[PDB]
Amino acid sequence: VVDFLKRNGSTLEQKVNLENPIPIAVLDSYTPSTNEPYARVSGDLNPIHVSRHFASYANLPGTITHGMFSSASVRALIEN
Amino acid sequence: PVMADLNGGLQFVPELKEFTAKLRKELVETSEVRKAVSIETALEHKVV
Numbered sequence A: 001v002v003d004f005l006k007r008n009g010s011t012l013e014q015k016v017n018l019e020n021p022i023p024i025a026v027l028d029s030y031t032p033s034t035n036e037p038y039a040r041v042s043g044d045l046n047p048i049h050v051s052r053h054f055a056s057y058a059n060l061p062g063t064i065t066h067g068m069f070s071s072a073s074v075r076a077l078i079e080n
Numbered sequence B: 001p002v003m004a005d006l007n008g009g010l011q012f013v014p015e016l017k018e019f020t021a022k023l024r025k026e027l028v029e030t031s032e033v034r035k036a037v038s039i040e041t042a043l044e045h046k047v048v
Helices: A034-043 A069-078 B017-043
Strands: none
Touching: none
């Protein structure tokens, strides 16, 4: 039912690209000292970002940040 | 001088022009729709 709509009809794409991209900013942020302050707020007590006997258990570079923190910071990096 | 109407009666079927132009306009529809429906069902049969 999509094939018969692929070649027979078009795609009503609501995303319309601008003619030329216009940059707004190139900024910098700082990952926190530790992941404990965020882990307590978000209720996400994920021991991959706080403990070390776990990030090393998962072959990770170390006690990584929270990815969700990294999302929220960059979003805050944008609203301003 | 004689005239010899060897015409089958085609002076009687009235308004023959589009009576003709309709008989063939239908023979392209019934031909092309079974061209398009046939190929897509064969194409339908290639995606399921």
